[PDB]
Amino acid sequence: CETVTGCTCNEGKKEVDCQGKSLDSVPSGIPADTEKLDLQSTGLATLSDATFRGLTKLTWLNLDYNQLQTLSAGVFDDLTELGTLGLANNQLASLPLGVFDHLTQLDKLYLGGNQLKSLPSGVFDRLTKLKELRLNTNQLQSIPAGAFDKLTNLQTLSLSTNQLQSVPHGAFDRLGKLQTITLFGNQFDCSRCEILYLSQWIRENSNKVKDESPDGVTCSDGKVVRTVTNETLKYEC
Known part of the structure; x- marks a missing residue:
């Protein structure tokens, strides 16, 4: 293993550490x-549909600090047992439709520090047990309506340091277990009626807004x- 992979293999921990x-x-x-x-800090720039073939036992995959642009x-289709997926600090420019759909047991998804401008509509829908979702430090121009609706287990959602001018009406309403949300470093447009959802939400959930910092x-x-x-807004909404 150690000679074939170039990495450290620990059979007792079922770990390959590169x-x-x-x-x-x-x-x-x-x-x-x-x-x-x-696989953190390994200089990876691409992955294929073959890369993780057959890793049906894998629970923790860390691809942080590489140079991935495209998936x-x-x-990840074989990685049905995955619980933690680290994809932070790559150069991700988009996510393909269905990319996380097989990861139904996912608990933490780290997507911070990429180049994401958008997300496909149901990209998180299958992740019903997700507890942490980090999306900070991208260039998100909006959030799709319903993006978080299936994430009923979610405890932490990071949205800070993006390019957000609003959040869709009702964006957070299904997040009954939410403990921490970050929303600083955006460019919210308080002149548009769309802000009223967010202002009322922050008023009713201030303890959850963190840097606590409503x-x-x-x-x-x-x-x-x-x-x-x-x-x-002069009663114009």
């Missing part, structure tokens, strides 16, 4: 019974978002 080792591609020879695969659409969520114009009411 962290910090230069790779031109994910190595061959990963045992089919592997549970934990550490093949079937890249007043840190501010309009592109300087107003603190939770201060904005239809009266602010």
Whole structure:
């Protein structure tokens, strides 16, 4: 294993740890019974539908700090037991439709630090047990209506440092177990009626808004978002 992969293999932990080792591609020879695969900081730039073939026991995959721009659409399809997927700090420009659909047992999904401008509509729909979703430090221009509706288990949602001007009406209403949300570093437009959903939400959920920092969520114009009411907008909504 250790000679075939170039990485450290620990059979007792069902772990293949390549962290910090230069790779031109994910190595061959990963045992089919592997549970934990550490590919962080390996310099990976592409993955294929073949890369993780047969890793039906894998629970933890860390692809953080690589140079991925594009994911093949079937890249994670065999990884049905996956619980943690680290994809933070790559150069992801988009996510293909259905990319996470097989990961139904996923608990944490790290997507922060990429180049995402958009998300496909039902991209998170199958992740019904997800507890953490990190989307901070991308370039998100909007969130699809319903994006989070199936995430009834969600405890943490990070949306800070994006390009968001609004959130869709009712974006967070299904998130009954939510504990932490981040929303700073956006450019919310407090002149548009769309803001009223978010201002009322922040007022009713201030304890959940974190840097706790509800007043840190501010309009592109300087107003603190939770201060904005239809009266602010001259009753025009």
